[PDB]
């Protein structure tokens, strides 16, 4: 077995194996972007009333499903290796997990291009000046030739402080500060 290119995230699960294999195959021949686009457009052609049905139906032969998908992917301009991936999923019966495979590969490619969102959850959003200030400070945290995404949340339970998860760090200056008052309560 030839060695395969490991994706950066290295997700696990049934979709994990397929996503890792696809990432390794597309890294070879340098077709990551084309495969990613074909995956993001193949999910939409996997949610039609006719297409979504007859693949979750367990009483139709896999051969029928394989062909129904081979001709569909052929007429959908797909003639690289993504057609092979769809055919393999149809043959192995993991068709229901195909959206999960697409999501996993999308996350892998996102980590290849973007970064883990810096989730901030304090309260209702403040002024846009503070938003861009925190975006700039998060960029300074990253500062590795990369650009991070942002996800702002609202939490009434969290008091005047904020909690920020810059990647996998998750600093905490929030209602837990008032929890740390137990030290005075203890001794």
């Amino acid at each position: 077995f030839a060695k395969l290119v490991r994706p950066p995230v290295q997700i696990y699960g049934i979709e994990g194996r397929y996503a890792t294999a696809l990432y390794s195959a597309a890294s070879k021949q340098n077709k990551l972007e084309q495969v990613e686009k074909e995956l993001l457009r193949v999910a939409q052609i996997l949610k039609e009333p006719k297409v979504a049905a007859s693949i979750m139906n367990p009483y139709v032969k896999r051969s029928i499903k394989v062909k129904s998908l081979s001709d569909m992917t052929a007429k959908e301009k797909f003639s690289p290796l993504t057609s092979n991936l769809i055919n393999l999923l149809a043959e192995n019966g993991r068709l229901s997990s195909t959206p999960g495979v697409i999501s996993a590969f999308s996350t892998m490619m996102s980590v290849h291009r973007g970064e883990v969102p810096c989730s901030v959850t304090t309260a209702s959003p403040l002024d846009e000046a503070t938003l861009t200030e925190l975006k700039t400070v998060l960029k300074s945290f990253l500062s590795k030739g990369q650009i991070l995404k942002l996800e702002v949340k609202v939490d009434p339970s969290i008091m005047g402080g904020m909690i920020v998860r810059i990647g996998e760090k998750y600093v905490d200056m929030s209602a837990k500060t008032k929890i740390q008052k137990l030290s005075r309560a203890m001794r």
Binding site: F1, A2, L4, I14, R17, Y18, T20, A21, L22, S24, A25, K28, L81, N84, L85, L88, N92
Partner: peptide
């Protein structure tokens, strides 16, 4: 998963080799 559902066999299938 299955024994032949490994990533290497899947890569061999999708790559067409």
């Amino acid at each position: 998963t299955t024994t032949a559902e490994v990533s290497s066999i899947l890569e061999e299938r999708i790559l067409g080799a």
